[PDB]
Amino acid sequence: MSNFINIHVLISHSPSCLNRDDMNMQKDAIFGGKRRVRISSQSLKRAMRKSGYYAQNIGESSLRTIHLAQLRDVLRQKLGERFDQKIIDKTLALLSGKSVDEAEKISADAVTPWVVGEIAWFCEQVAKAEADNLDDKKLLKVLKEDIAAIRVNLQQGVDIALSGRMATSGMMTELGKVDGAMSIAHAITTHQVDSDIDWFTAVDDLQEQGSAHLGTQEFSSGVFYRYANINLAQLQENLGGASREQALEIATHVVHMLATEVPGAKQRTYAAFNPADMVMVNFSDMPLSMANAFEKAVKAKDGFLQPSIQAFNQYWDRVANGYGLNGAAAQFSLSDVDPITAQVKQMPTLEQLKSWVRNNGEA
Amino acid sequence: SNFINIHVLISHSPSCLNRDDMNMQKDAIFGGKRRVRISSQSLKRAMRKSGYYAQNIGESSLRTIHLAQLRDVLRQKLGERFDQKIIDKTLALLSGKSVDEAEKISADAVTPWVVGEIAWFCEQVAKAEADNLDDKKLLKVLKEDIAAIRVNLQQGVDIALSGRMATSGMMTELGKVDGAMSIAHAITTHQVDSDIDWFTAVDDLQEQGSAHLGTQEFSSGVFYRYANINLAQLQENLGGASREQALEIATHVVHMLATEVPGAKQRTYAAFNPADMVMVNFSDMPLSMANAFEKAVKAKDGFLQPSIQAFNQYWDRVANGYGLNGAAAQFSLSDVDPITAQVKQMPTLEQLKSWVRNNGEA
Amino acid sequence: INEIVTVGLGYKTALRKALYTFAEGFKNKDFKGAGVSVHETAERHFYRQSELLIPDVLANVNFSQADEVIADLRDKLHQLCEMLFNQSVAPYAHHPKLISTLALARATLYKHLRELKP
Amino acid sequence: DEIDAMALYRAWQQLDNGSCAQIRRVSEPDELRDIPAFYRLVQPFGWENPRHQQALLRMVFCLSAGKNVIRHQDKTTGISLGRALANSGRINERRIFQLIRADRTADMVQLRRLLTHAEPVLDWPLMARMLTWWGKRERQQLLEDFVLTTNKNA
Amino acid sequence: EIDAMALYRAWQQLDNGSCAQIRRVSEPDELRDIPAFYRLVQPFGWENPRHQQALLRMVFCLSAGKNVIRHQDKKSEQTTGISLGRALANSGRINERRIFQLIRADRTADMVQLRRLLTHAEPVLDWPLMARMLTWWGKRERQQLLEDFVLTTNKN
Amino acid sequence: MRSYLILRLAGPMQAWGQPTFEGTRPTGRFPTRSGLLGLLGACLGIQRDDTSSLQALSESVQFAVRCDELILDDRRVSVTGLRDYHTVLGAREDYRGLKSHETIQTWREYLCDASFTVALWLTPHATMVISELEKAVLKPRYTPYLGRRSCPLTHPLFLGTCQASDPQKALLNYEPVGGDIYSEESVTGHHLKFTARDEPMITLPRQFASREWYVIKGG
């Protein structure tokens, strides 16, 4: 069992509002007939992309936009010393399907993730049109043959290699379709939650102290369960046939981010900067989520955290024994517990867990 | 008995494993109550296109049908309709090795769709010998068809278990291959409270900012999958065929039902959950246990436990009343158990598959 | 005949309008909409149940003296619209955000249904 | 077929300041079970039949807001709790979102705090029946009534 | 798996010495220290801990005296036996505020109070009922006790 | 005094054909003759190629269908329709080649919650006995469904056997009474017809011919 790597995270948050509705209400979801506070998987993804850790260890994130009129200026700024403006314009025009007018505002069909590396690569490839003129469709047919060569430039993307992208217009609809490679679930609380409401006011220094109607902000604490899953082969493919070890390094970065990164919503005013209390990683031939460990909403004994850990471990034992799974399984917990069973190796620190992942579960 | 019944109770975390033409969860009214549904085609594709299927069925030892083995039988089943020379011509064009050259391994029975197709070929080479277009001239016009049957003669178990592949070079009425496993629509055991995810799309160049709005329906729930296997049909379409082999395939079907999940929005919702219960029982007639949840299950401590309970309690009073007989085995992850014995309790799934493989004998 | 047809179509449009309002919402006093298309799958139910009632009576009425048949028809269609409305709205009626909307949607529904009586 | 009469309300009106003081001083309906004056009050209706106990706990708990918090007004049908709380104008709809999302004892608490703050006028038997069941449809209907009335009086 | 009425009978038949040893005890936990208790309670529940607490309570109540708790079988017309609340009410010596304080007590304290009441009441009751309420001794049982007392006084 | 075989059709979803050459594949409120004949045919193990056994079975037997309305918690649950959006990837472009479309779409109506009690009897020109049919529906050879393979049974086909003069009188012996009945035999005091194109033209696959039900209405 060594194609899919499964990441399970139990993380408790102090009173906050990490993800909102269209009525500025806490995102929720019904599980096991009970209301759970929810964090969007898109929210977690973006929280990862725009994180400092990602910038330090993985690289630059993709630039998602529809505004090609601004994007042409950006690309002209970052690629102007390497290419001519007409070539860049023809490049972006070919990829998007729209025309670069030097106008004030021209938009694309939808929000698109652009990585400057592959765009520079496309500038180099469209510079072959400066050579013996191939028709644009001809050049397209040439590029169709070697997609791996395009995916090599996606190592400056990765978030695209992890989350994928879809194009509707331009040349990107035939060259830029990325499928894999990371499947992440919506973070839901392991227990039933009755959300509290902050009834706030706004003191007017030129009128107050006086009467005023009040405002509302829905907030809540809770033990969230995050799940992620990485298809190593698909990641290797998405990076242009990259080595497995590299994919595992990226995987460890994903582990760390999933264990530490928290969406920055309402953090200036609520500040729920809490680390994960449990992180388990297991290799498998088939993806496996332990959400059904909380299908029966956990009830508080000494908080929601400990019975969540306990329920998680119990359900993992039941599933593991029932379906005869054999990892490659390691668990990291802050709390002292009675977890089990061999060989779900206990890691004292998170870094030892990440190291255990880098060495393909054998360490 | 001829039929194998597979019943699966599996819980799914918040997701959307099946959509309609308007990006909404597929549903079905049962007992007057709305149930979230996962179409049978979605499940059957999720199985047929899976890697486990490709390993245990895509590469089975009985996937290749050698025509040279079927020399004699095809001569006596089509001797009423065609002459021997025509048949030998067809086999020589299809194999394509003429010699007879008895393999010392001449089969006893033949798969129906095979004789159905090669009969069509016999007709074609007959009218081709009447026209008459020479062997090369006609082999030129029958290229796609010949290749089409040649690829089918290497996928015996796939066709036998799942049916033809929706684009197989089949023409005759016998070429319409059904079964051998029947997959039912997976419905929730309970009434579902559907949630609506309200998402946006952030523009990195105007974060001020006008938000791109969107909605997507999702819901968690306990689904009841049902499937059955016709062993006689599976043996006939592999004919062949020993019952033990058919059982060996049936085990694969059980496993796939207990594990495989559709890939709809699994990249964003990730409902990679395993089956919390699976029971297998032999019978002279296939029967779904859907009426166990005809009255919508209401949550006591989740939906899973009262679903297990409802299922078992239904099986207790209903099982003997209907023609279920024996034998039956159940693999679950939580008590209680059905008060009735004659339903062996299996600790692991592998023990259950081993139980199926031994024709339900202890 | 024209009256029977227009009655049926009238109740149809009542239901569809109500559910559409439940979908899109009411912008003026900031009532949020569900974001789902339930009107189309409910209209099919309405139509399926209507094929049993309207042609059946329309075949067997004494046109000279049969407005009371049209009246019981109105009653049956009314009940049908109520039932189908509540059924279509049921899975989404657990979030206050949407309950506040379905209050008004139901209100408009009964406005139209009230306007269908002679 | 056994219904709790409106007499209870009248009884609550006519009860002495001492016992009413003992009753008002309560956080939860179980603590209402704790005090004797409650049993003396609720016996005729009555308490000794467990089918009625929960309903009585809710009703008495709501009345415990005060002697003249819940103002009875005769009616086609009388003013409902939603319509009442809406007409009061002092209640914010978010707190009713809270009320509909609350669980067990909590909701009753939240309800009581509302009544004291609202001083509502309503037909008491309606509220009595709704408290008798207090299912999902009672909650939903409450929110509907409130929202619709507030929208209709703005 | 249930404790019989035999215990009561046993308590009736036991000699004065051991009864003296048991009677002079302040708390139910202090009852564990003396051996005569173990000898008395040995047939019924030890070593199955599920009954132990209950037994500690029961004997403690019985420790009030040899003929303090007077047992009366339920009449065929009565359908249910006289309850502890009804008993304390019928006695007429008990003031309701001490039963209020009884419902407000916690753990050992309540038993301390309860015994003190029995000695002052000399109540008549159906012993299996009191035993049953003492086995669990949840909040509902307490409140039910108060129900019986207050309701008995108000109705009669 | 005819002999009747009484069967039950009780899936959570059901489908009974109606005239169609398009993607949208509709259903009726009750089983069709072609459907029931295909059902018994499946039970008996009749392949699609042999016109003989098909013809024999079709000429041999006749049907009567009773619509059983569902009652649970003394509440009536009327029948309802479904519209399944059913796509195919890699479908046939042509009948002969291996060329395919990326995606085709079909719409398929289903029937929940429907249950039926069906009484069948032998024609005078019968080629088999009711015993063979009983033994067949008790121990089928091919998987029985109603009427798509997606739709399984929740109650055994065989419900019983009886002696009676009318199919109505034969149906009365079994529990869910009061449902409408569509038979191929007429009963006194009953007039209404119901037209349907559900009699399979066996000589010519795969098309159907017009026929009519006799309608009986109870209470």
Pull the structure tokens for residue B2. Answer: 């001829």
Least CB–CB distance from D103: residue in A194, A197, A214:
A194
Contact A290, A315 (CB under 8 A): yes
Tell whether F24 is within 8 A of chain C (Cβ). no
Tell whether B335 is within 8 A of chain A (Cβ). no
Pull the structure tokens for residue A348. Answer: 């004292």
Residues D39-52 as b/e (b if ≥16 CB within 10 A, e otherwise) read bbbbeebebeeeeb
Question: Residue B22 and residue C91: Cβ atoms within 8 Å?
Answer: no
Pull the structure tokens for residue C43. Answer: 């209209």
Least CB–CB distance from B285: residue in F49, F75, F157:
F157
Kindly give, in sequence order, each residue whose CB lies less than 8 Å from that of residue E132, ignoring residues fewer than 6 positions away. none
Residues of F in contact with C44 (CB under 8 A): 81, 83
Least CB–CB distance from D94: residue in A192, A194, A197:
A197
- Widest pairwise Cα distance in chain E: 45
Residues of E in contact with D40 (CB under 8 A): 150-151, 154
Q: Which amino acid is at E92?
A: G
CA B62, CA B58: separation in Å to the nearest integer? 10
Pull the structure tokens for residue D57. Answer: 């706990």
Task: Say which CATH number the domain at E116 has.
Answer: 1.10.520.40
Residues of C in contact with D147 (CB under 8 A): 99-100, 103-104
If you measure CA to CA, which chain B residue comes closest to F95?
B171
Least CB–CB distance from B269: residue in A34, A186, A297:
A186
Residues F177-213 as b/e (b if ≥16 CB within 10 A, e otherwise) read eebbbbbbeebeeeeeeeebebbbebeeeeebeeeeb
Q: How many folded domains does chain F comprise?
A: 1
Size of interface B-C (CB pairs under 8 A): 25
* DSSP codes joined into one string, B296-338: PP--SSSSHHHHHHHHHHHHHHHHHHTT--S-EEEEESS----
Residue B109: other Cβ atoms inside 10 A? 14
Tell whether D105 is within 8 A of chain A (Cβ). no
Task: Say which CATH number the domain at F154 has.
Answer: 3.30.70.2660
Tell whether B325 is within 8 A of chain F (Cβ). no
Q: If we measure between CA atoms, which residue out of A69, A56, A58, A78 comes closest to residue A123?
A: A78
Q: How far is CA A199 from CA A24, C115, E1, in A?
A: 14, 42, 55
Question: Residue B199 and residue A296: Cβ atoms within 8 Å?
Answer: no
B contact residues 12-51, partner F, Cβ 8 Å cutoff: 20-21, 26, 28-32, 39-41
Phi, psi of A323 (to 5 degrees): -105, 5
Q: If we measure between CA atoms, which residue out of F111, F113, F114, F93 comes closest to residue F102?
A: F93
For chain D, the three-class secondary structure string (H helix, E strand, C coil) is CCCCCCHHHHHHHHCCHHHHHHHHCCCCHHHHHHCHHHHHHHCCCCCCCHHHHHHHHHHHHHHCCCCCCCEECCCCCCCCHHHHHHHHCCCCHHHHHHHHHCCCHHHHHHHHHHHHHHCCEECHHHHHHHHHHCCHHHHHHHHHHHHHHHHHHC
CA F92, CA A171: separation in Å to the nearest integer? 29
Q: Is F13 helix (H, G, I), strand (E, B) or coil?
A: coil
Size of interface A-B (CB pairs under 8 A): 140
Pull the structure tokens for residue B37. Answer: 């549904």
* Rounded-to-10 torsion of CA A148, A149, A155, A160: -60
Residue with tokens 């002292």: A336
Residues, chain F, total?
219
Kindly give, in sequence order, each residue whose CB lies less than 8 Å from that of residue B196, ignoring residues fewer than 6 positions away. B215, B216, B217, B218, C34, C35, C36, C92, C95, C98
For chain A, the three-class secondary structure string (H helix, E strand, C coil) is CCCEEEEEEEEEEEEECCCECCCCCECEEEECCEEEEEECHHHHHHHHHCCHHHHHHCCCCCEEEEEHHHHHHHHHHHHCCCCCHHHHHHHHHHHHCCCCCCCCCCEEEEEEEECHHHHHHHHHHHCCCCCCCCCHHHHHHHHHHCCHHHHHHHHHCCHHHHHCECCCCCCHHHHCCECCCEEECCEEECCCCCCEEEEECCCCCCCCCCCCCCEEEEEEEEEEEEEEEEEHHHHHHHCCCCCHHHHHHHHHHHHHHHHHCCCCCCCCCCCCCCCCCEEEEEEECCCCCCHHHHCCCCCCCCCCHHHHHHHHHHHHHHHHHHHCCCCCEEEEECCCCCCCCCCEEEECCHHHHHHHHHCCCCC
Residue C27: other Cβ atoms inside 10 A? 9
Question: Residue F81 and residue C41: Cβ atoms within 8 Å?
Answer: no
Kindly give, in sequence order, each residue whose CB lies less than 8 Å from that of residue A162, ignoring residues fewer than 6 positions away. A180, A181, A182, A230, A235, A238, A250, A254
Q: How far is CA C52 from CA B113, B120, C44, C56, in A?
A: 44, 48, 13, 6
CA B168, CA B145: separation in Å to the nearest integer? 9
Phi, psi of A44 (to 5 degrees): -65, -45
Contact A155, A232 (CB under 8 A): no
Pull the structure tokens for residue B228. Answer: 């059955």
Physical contact, C and A (3 or more Cβ pairs within 8 A): yes
Residues, chain D, total?
154
Residues, chain B, total?
362
Physical contact, E and A (3 or more Cβ pairs within 8 A): no
CA A49, CA A157: separation in Å to the nearest integer? 10
Strands B343-346 and B328-332: parallel
Binding-site residues on chain C for chain B (CB distance < 8 A): 34-37, 40, 87, 90-92, 94-95, 98
Pull the structure tokens for residue E41. Answer: 């309670």
Cα four-point dihedral sign B257, B262, B263, B268: negative
Physical contact, D and F (3 or more Cβ pairs within 8 A): no
Q: Is B114 helix (H, G, I), strand (E, B) or coil?
A: helix
For residue C97, what is the enclosing H or E element? Answer: helix C96-115
Cα four-point dihedral sign A118, B269, A243, A256: positive
Measured distance between the N- and C-terminal CA atoms of chain C, rounded to whole angstroms:
16
If you measure CA to CA, which chain A residue comes closest to B203?
A65
Instruction: Tally the C-alpha atoms within 13 A of residue E139's C-alpha that lie toward its C-beta.
Output: 8
CA F145, CA B182: separation in Å to the nearest integer? 9
For chain E, the three-class secondary structure string (H helix, E strand, C coil) is CCCCCHHHHHHHHCCHHHHHHHHCCCCCCHHHHCHHHHHHHCCCCCCCCCCHHHHHHHHHHHCCCCCCCEECCCCCCCCCCCCHHHHHHHHCCCCHHHHHHHHHCCCHHHHHHHHHHHHHHCCEECHHHHHHHHHHCCHHHHHHHHHHHHHHHHHC
C19, C20, C32, C36: best to mutate for the B interface, most B CBs within 10 A: C36
Residues of B in contact with C37 (CB under 8 A): 22, 24
Residues of B in contact with A31 (CB under 8 A): 13-14, 220
CA E62, CA E67: separation in Å to the nearest integer? 9
Pull the structure tokens for residue E93. Answer: 């010596």
* DSSP codes joined into one string, B154-185: T-HHHHHHH---SS-S--SGGG----SEEEPP
Question: Residue B34 and residue C91: Cβ atoms within 8 Å?
Answer: yes
In the DSSP assignment, the letter for residue C64 is: G
Contact D135, D11 (CB under 8 A): no
Contact F188, F169 (CB under 8 A): no
Q: Which amino acid is at E140?
A: R
D contact residues 69-98, partner A, Cβ 8 Å cutoff: 92, 94-95, 98
CA E21, CA E15: separation in Å to the nearest integer? 10
Provide the domain limits for residue E140. Answer: 1-156
Q: Is B104 helix (H, G, I), strand (E, B) or coil?
A: coil
Q: If we measure between CA atoms, which residue out of A268, A352, A280 comes closest to residue A18?
A: A268
Residues of B in contact with C40 (CB under 8 A): 22
Pull the structure tokens for residue B189. Answer: 């055991």
* Rounded-to-10 torsion of CA B74, B78, B82, B85: 20
Phi, psi of B259 (to 5 degrees): -120, -45
Question: Residue E154 and residue D43: Cβ atoms within 8 Å?
Answer: yes
Contact B187, B204 (CB under 8 A): no
Tell whether D16 is within 8 A of chain A (Cβ). no
Pull the structure tokens for residue B316. Answer: 């207790």
F13, F70, F148: best to mutate for the B interface, most B CBs within 10 A: F13
Pull the structure tokens for residue E147. Answer: 């129900």
Pull the structure tokens for residue B121. Answer: 């070929």
* DSSP codes joined into one string, B205-271: T--SS--EEEEEEEEEEEEEEEEEEEHHHHHHTT-S--HHHHHHHHHHHHHHHHH----TTTTTS--
* DSSP codes joined into one string, B44-74: HHHHHTSHHHHHHTTT-TT----GGGGHHHH
Strands D121-122 and D71-72: parallel
CA F85, CA F103: separation in Å to the nearest integer? 13
CA F3, CA D125: separation in Å to the nearest integer? 62
For chain A, the domains span 1-363
CA B160, CA B233: separation in Å to the nearest integer? 8
Exposed (0-12), middle (13-18) or buried (19+): which is A268, by Cβ within 10 Å? exposed
Tell whether B192 is within 8 A of chain C (Cβ). yes
Least CB–CB distance from A295: residue in B11, B203, B272:
B11
Physical contact, E and F (3 or more Cβ pairs within 8 A): no
Provide the domain limits for residue F132. Answer: 1-219
Question: Residue F84 and residue B147: Cβ atoms within 8 Å?
Answer: no
CA D125, CA D3: separation in Å to the nearest integer? 10
CA E74, CA B210: separation in Å to the nearest integer? 79
Q: Which amino acid is at D110?
A: Q
Pull the structure tokens for residue B46. Answer: 């999720």
Question: Residue C36 and residue B24: Cβ atoms within 8 Å?
Answer: yes
Contact C15, C81 (CB under 8 A): yes
Q: How far is CA F95 from CA A346, B148, B160, F92, F100, in A?
A: 60, 12, 21, 7, 10
Q: If we measure between CA atoms, which residue out of F12, C36, A257, A289 comes closest to residue B15?
A: A289
Pull the structure tokens for residue B108. Answer: 């006893």
